[PDB]
């Protein structure tokens, strides 16, 4: 039970403030350099280095380990909120997926009204305009765990084991945020993925469709939709 | 259920196979190994095919909309939409089966000989009459094999067979004739084989 946005402030004061002498005796600014080019569009994964976090606050890597996935979204949304005060250039479309942000953000400026509050359900999911991944390396401290070892009290840990690859599936497309399209109100409906499968929408939510009180069927869009590279692997007790 | 026949197939396919529907007074003519031609109208029957991709489907173009607590999402709104999967397997309804190549133009002996056609029965009768007959069947079937009368003459005795005979005990004799070709290597066994099963 801490304050998130403290926490989150804190994190933001590490990537923005930490620096190291990598380079020759060449104090840098690791993180920072990272995020100049997250923003670009030149990097997709940022390893955040639980050890360079330890160097000035160690109860911090504690709260990451006991509870990762959450400030593996804090560090996500720090990192977000991050690149805009980063960016330097403009990004050079790399893919569908940049065209397709880029429409969105340019038609959400385009009917911004900025001071009118909009409904928690009317906003782009965060993880719709990413683009980049964050990834923890664990701490040096941390000594490596073992399969049979690893049990119920480390759910939700920050756990590192060591073994042998028995077993690796190929790269699949696996659906982080679906997309659907209206038939009637040309709106884009959302529906972020968590579970290992969901149901298709079948009725639109748009603000045009619900006023209309029309039929308002959505189609489930490959194109709009978020994919990332998917592989499943069994790794084994050496 | 029939299948391509084997001068229809491609390179390197297995034959098509597809199932036929006889309706009334077709309903006992074809017999499975037949070769017949089936006149009829192609079509389409629905099946629920386990497609494990979403595809075509059926549904209301009535525009309604589930109310909070009802909302017409998930199964319920599948439901209600009457959502269906429109998938569909090409069966054949055939009107008509008639034999590929009739044996003759119009079961026993009389029956037979009506169904021939008058020179049709002519032919046979010429032939039946026909002294020598035996050295004329022997090489009208074997034409293209020389030497091996014997063996022609065996053939020609297995396709004809004997008369069985059920004995008043019940006792099946065997009427039909079996016949083994042993020989050396590349000495037109397997072509005797073939000109019998063409
Ligand atoms: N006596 C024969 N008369 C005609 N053709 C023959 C004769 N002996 C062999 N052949 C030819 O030689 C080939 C071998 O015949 P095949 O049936 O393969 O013999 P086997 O049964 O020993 O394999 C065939 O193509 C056949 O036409
Ligand atoms: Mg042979
Ligand atoms: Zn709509």
């Given at each position: 039970l801490?304050?998130?946005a403290?926490?989150?402030?804190?994190?933001?004061?590490?990537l923005?403030?930490?620096?190291?002498?990598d380079?020759?005796?060449?104090?840098?600014?690791?993180?920072?350099?990272?995020?100049?080019?997250?923003?670009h569009?030149?990097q997709?994964?940022l390893?955040?280095?639980?050890d360079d976090?330890?160097?000035?606050?160690?109860?911090?890597?504690?709260?990451?380990?006991?509870?990762?996935?959450?400030y593996?979204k804090?560090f996500?949304?720090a990192?977000?909120?991050?690149?805009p005060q980063y960016?330097?250039?403009?990004v050079?479309?790399?893919?569908?997926?940049?065209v397709?942000?880029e429409?969105?953000?340019?038609?959400?400026?385009?009917?911004?009204?900025?001071?009118?509050?909009?409904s928690?359900?009317?906003?782009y999911?965060a993880?719709?305009?990413?683009?980049?991944?964050?990834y923890?390396?664990?701490?040096?401290?941390?000594?490596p765990?073992v399969?049979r070892?690893?049990?119920?009290?480390?759910?939700?840990?920050?756990?590192?084991?060591?073994?042998?690859?028995?077993?690796?599936?190929?790269v699949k497309?696996?659906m982080?945020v679906?997309?659907?399209?209206?038939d009637?109100?040309g709106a884009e409906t959302?529906?972020?993925?968590?579970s290992?499968?969901?149901?298709?929408?079948?009725?639109?939510?748009?603000?045009?469709?619900?006023?209309?009180?029309?039929?308002?069927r959505?189609?489930?869009?490959?194109?709009?939709?978020r994919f990332?590279?998917?592989?499943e692997?069994?790794?084994?007790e050496? | 259920?029939?299948?391509?026949?084997?001068?229809?197939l491609?390179?390197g396919?297995?034959?098509r196979?597809?199932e036929?529907?006889?309706?009334?007074?077709?309903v006992?003519?074809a017999?499975?190994?037949?070769?017949?031609?089936?006149?009829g109208?192609?079509?389409?029957?629905?099946?629920?095919?386990?497609?494990?991709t979403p595809?075509?489907?059926?549904?209301?173009?009535?525009?309604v909309?589930?109310?909070?607590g009802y909302e017409?999402?998930?199964?319920?709104?599948?439901?209600?939409?009457?959502?269906?999967?429109?998938?569909?397997?090409?069966v054949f309804?055939?009107?008509?089966?008639?034999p590929?190549?009739?044996?003759?133009?119009?079961?026993?002996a009389?029956?037979?000989?009506?169904?021939?056609?008058?020179?049709?029965?002519?032919?046979?009768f010429?032939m039946?009459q026909?002294?020598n007959?035996?050295?004329?069947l022997?090489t009208?079937?074997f034409?293209?094999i020389h030497?091996?009368?014997?063996?022609?003459?065996?053939?020609?005795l297995?396709?004809?067979?004997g008369?069985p005979?059920t004995?008043?005990?019940?006792?099946?004799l065997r009427?039909?004739?079996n016949?083994?070709?042993?020989?050396?290597?590349?000495?037109?066994?397997?072509?005797?084989?073939?000109?019998?099963?063409?």
């Open positions: 801490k304050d998130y403290l926490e989150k402030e804190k994190v933001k004061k590490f923005q403030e930490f620096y190291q002498d380079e020759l005796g060449k104090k840098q600014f690791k993180y920072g350099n990272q995020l100049v080019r997250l923003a569009r030149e997709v994964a390893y955040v280095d639980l976090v330890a160097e000035d606050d160690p109860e911090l890597v504690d709260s990451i380990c006991e509870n990762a996935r959450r593996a804090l996500a949304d990192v977000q909120e991050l690149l960016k330097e250039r403009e050079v479309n790399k893919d569908v997926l940049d397709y942000i429409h969105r953000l340019m038609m959400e400026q385009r009917s911004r009204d900025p001071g009118m509050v909009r928690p359900q009317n906003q999911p993880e719709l305009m990413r683009r980049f991944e964050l923890f390396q664990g701490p040096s401290s941390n000594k765990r399969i070892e690893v049990r119920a009290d480390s759910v939700g840990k920050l756990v590192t084991v060591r073994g042998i690859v028995t077993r690796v599936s190929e497309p696996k982080v679906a997309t659907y399209t209206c009637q109100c959302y529906q972020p993925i968590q290992p499968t969901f149901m298709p929408l079948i009725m639109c939510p748009s603000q045009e469709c619900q006023t209309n009180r029309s039929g308002g959505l189609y489930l869009q490959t194109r709009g939709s990332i590279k998917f592989q692997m069994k790794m084994q050496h | 259920r029939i299948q391509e026949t084997q001068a229809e491609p390179r396919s297995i034959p196979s597809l036929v529907i006889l309706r009334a007074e077709a006992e003519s017999q499975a190994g037949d070769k017949c031609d089936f006149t109208t192609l079509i389409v029957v629905p099946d629920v095919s386990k497609l494990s595809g075509a489907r059926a549904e209301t173009n009535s525009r909309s589930g109310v909070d017409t999402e998930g199964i319920r709104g599948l439901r209600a939409l009457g959502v269906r999967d429109l998938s569909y397997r090409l309804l055939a009107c008509c089966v008639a590929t190549n009739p044996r003759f133009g119009g079961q026993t009389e029956s037979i000989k009506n169904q021939m056609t008058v020179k049709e029965w002519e032919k046979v010429e039946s026909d002294k007959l035996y050295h004329n022997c009208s079937l034409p293209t030497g091996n009368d014997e063996v022609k003459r065996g053939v020609l297995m396709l004809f067979g008369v005979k004995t008043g005990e019940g006792t099946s009427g039909d004739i016949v083994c070709i042993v020989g050396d290597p590349s000495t037109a066994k397997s072509q005797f084989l073939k000109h019998v099963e063409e």
